[PDB]
Design a protein around this ligand. Sequence first.
Ligand SMILES: [Mg+2]
Length: 233
Amino acid sequence: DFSPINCLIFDLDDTLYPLKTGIAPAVKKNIDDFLVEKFGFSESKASSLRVELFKTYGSTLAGLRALGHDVHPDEYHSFVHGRLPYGSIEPNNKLRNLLNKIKQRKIIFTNSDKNHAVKVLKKLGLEDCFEEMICFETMNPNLFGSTTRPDEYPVVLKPSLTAMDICIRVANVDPRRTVFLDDNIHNITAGKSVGLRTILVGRAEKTKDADYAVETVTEIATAVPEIWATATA
Ligand SMILES: [Mg+2]
């Protein structure tokens, strides 16, 4: 049977640029340094808390608020992303050409704040390629003013199905007609569970929940030939 692809949802970090760029370990270091600044922890204790909060709540920001700390998202993102070596993100001309050839609607779906995402897309040369962006603010629209308690509006992040649902609703996605590209195996599982077709980025081998796997995102031009199909049924 034929299901056309009318929409592509792209993760940002480590999907539209390769993991080996080195942004991901810088973000981990920055989160540890944020916890040292907040709590006067050693770096070693900071790392221990980061991974616990990441595992339990989805991120250190999510966890701090769940535990009763009134950490505004801007404080966190300014520290953790603001400090990043954005200069190390290389433009990808092949990718820009590909996205421009692709006729389907293209969406960004990221846990990062919009400010970070826009900086990354600018470095990549992709700032006009996407017609919707579902970012941290999108998933957490009530988290920027006063709250009754620190966790009145719990932080929503990928890979939660809550996050998936917000992406699908904001972008008005038909999951049967949509492919989702992400480097994170848990995000791929979540996407598959809400009916999306899935492309694991950063591995050549598929997980059980990946329809395709490519090491680099530009490989979809040949690995996913249905992108170029013209049938609509
Ligand atoms: Mg990613």
